[PDB]
Design a protein around this ligand. Structure first.
Ligand code: A1ACT
Ligand code: BOG
Ligand code: BOG
Length: 341
């Protein structure tokens, strides 16, 4: 067992192994707080996330378990991965703190579009990396469901990694697929493609595509561009109210994407039209998108790997906080780090 040391950072008390020095706060989310640290064993800076109140309720416990099991499975350059997992606890009784260690990125994508003026080559590389990691995640039968700029970390090298939760230290609805905002509850993997399409449009133009003020304003904005849904889509909406509002709006023709995104790479416009499709059955998948001519300079089919199947069966079980905690402890003690290069 390594030597731990205790220091306080932003009303928060941190107990981390000796090998991580110079703890420096980066930001905070709702489920944890992130610090920068120097890894003496590798000579590289890293990010340490202390989970906030990990076992304070049934929801928190399952969430803690969920993040550990998921991040332990993700082994892909464009998806955040685990370099280390530790807890000062010496036993399961004495277990109540969880720390996760990953690579250290430079910022999130909304801290970059805030500068704006992103070149077209920059959009090809950034979106290609998202899709490439999206393909890996989707091959594991995982849906992100919350893709947004704050969940995309980037380096000054322009390398990108999909986070599970970003820093709140950019409304989520602006990037939500319309079916989620309708509460379909049977979401397709392509709900993430819609979000990617919303993010791409923002990178190319410098403005939020659908800056809706609420969930109802959000759908009116989506309809103004993609157009009122056809009869084939309407018959699939069971909600009379939802169907009533959609049809109640004065019909709006689909806008010419070429004009809305005039000045953009015509190959990018073509991709946006394939992602921003109302029917989720007709949206281009992540794997299909990587083969679009827009990513010709980066597409390498022998270097776009898939993931081993992920067991998500625990998601349905209703367990006690103590059982969620012991399972989390089991995952902590069993973690095997990836080998240093
Ligand atoms: C270990 O944390 C986590 C562990 C597991 C899952 C999620 C997380 N979360 C999480 C992970 C990273 C990894 N890099 N960044 C980061 C650093 C930024 C920054 O300002 N760096 C300075 C420039 O040199 C210091 S911006 C930004 C998005 C992160 C933010 C996170 F919320
Ligand atoms: C690295 C891959 C991240 C997987 C996405 C999990 C993190 C964001 O997704 C989480 O769980 C659900 C996922 O369907 C979302 O609906 C929730 O909003 C969020 O808490
Ligand atoms: C106000 C804009 C109307 C939104 C129409 C959303 C159509 C989404 O598409 C639908 O996704 C469903 C799952 O979510 C699938 O079950 C359907 O097969 C698919 O057509």
């Amino acid at each position: 067992r390594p030597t731990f040391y205790r220091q306080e950072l932003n009303k928060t008390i941190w107990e981390v192994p000796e090998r991580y020095q110079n703890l420096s706060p980066v930001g905070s989310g709702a489920y944890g707080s992130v610090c920068a640290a120097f890894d003496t064993k590798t000579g590289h800076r890293v990010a340490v996330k202390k989970l906030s109140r990990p076992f304070q309720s049934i929801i928190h416990a399952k969430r803690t378990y969920r993040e550990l099991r998921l991040l332990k499975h993700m082994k892909h350059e464009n998806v955040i991965g685990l370099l280390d997992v530790f807890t000062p606890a010496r036993s399961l009784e004495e277990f109540n703190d969880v720390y996760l260690v990953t690579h250290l990125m430079g910022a999130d994508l909304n801290n970059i579009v805030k500068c704006q003026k992103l070149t077209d080559d920059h959009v090809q590389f950034l979106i290609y990396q998202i899709l490439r990691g999206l393909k890996y995640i989707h091959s594991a039968d995982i849906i992100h469901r919350d893709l947004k700029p704050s969940n995309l970390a980037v380096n000054e090298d322009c390398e990108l990694k999909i986070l599970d939760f970003g820093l709140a230290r950019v409304a989520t609805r602006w990037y939500r697929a319309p079916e989620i905002m309708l509460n379909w509850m049977h979401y397709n993997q392509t709900v993430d493609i819609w979000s990617v399409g919303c993010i791409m449009a923002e990178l190319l133009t410098g403005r939020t595509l659908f800056p809706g003020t609420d969930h109802i304003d959000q759908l009116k904005l989506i309809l103004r561009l993609v157009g009122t849904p056809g009869a084939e889509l309407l018959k699939k909406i069971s909600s009379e109210s939802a169907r009533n509002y959609i049809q109640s709006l004065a019909q709006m023709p689909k806008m010419n994407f070429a004009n809305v995104f005039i000045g953009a790479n015509p190959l990018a416009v073509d991709l946006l039209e394939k992602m921003l499709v109302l029917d989720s059955d007709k949206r281009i998948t992540a794997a299909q998108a990587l083969a679009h001519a827009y990513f010709a300079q980066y597409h390498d089919p022998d270097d776009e790997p898939v993931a081993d199947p992920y067991d998500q069966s625990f998601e349905s079980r209703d367990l006690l906080i103590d059982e969620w905690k012991s399972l989390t402890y089991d995952e902590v003690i069993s973690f095997v780090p990836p080998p240093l290069d």
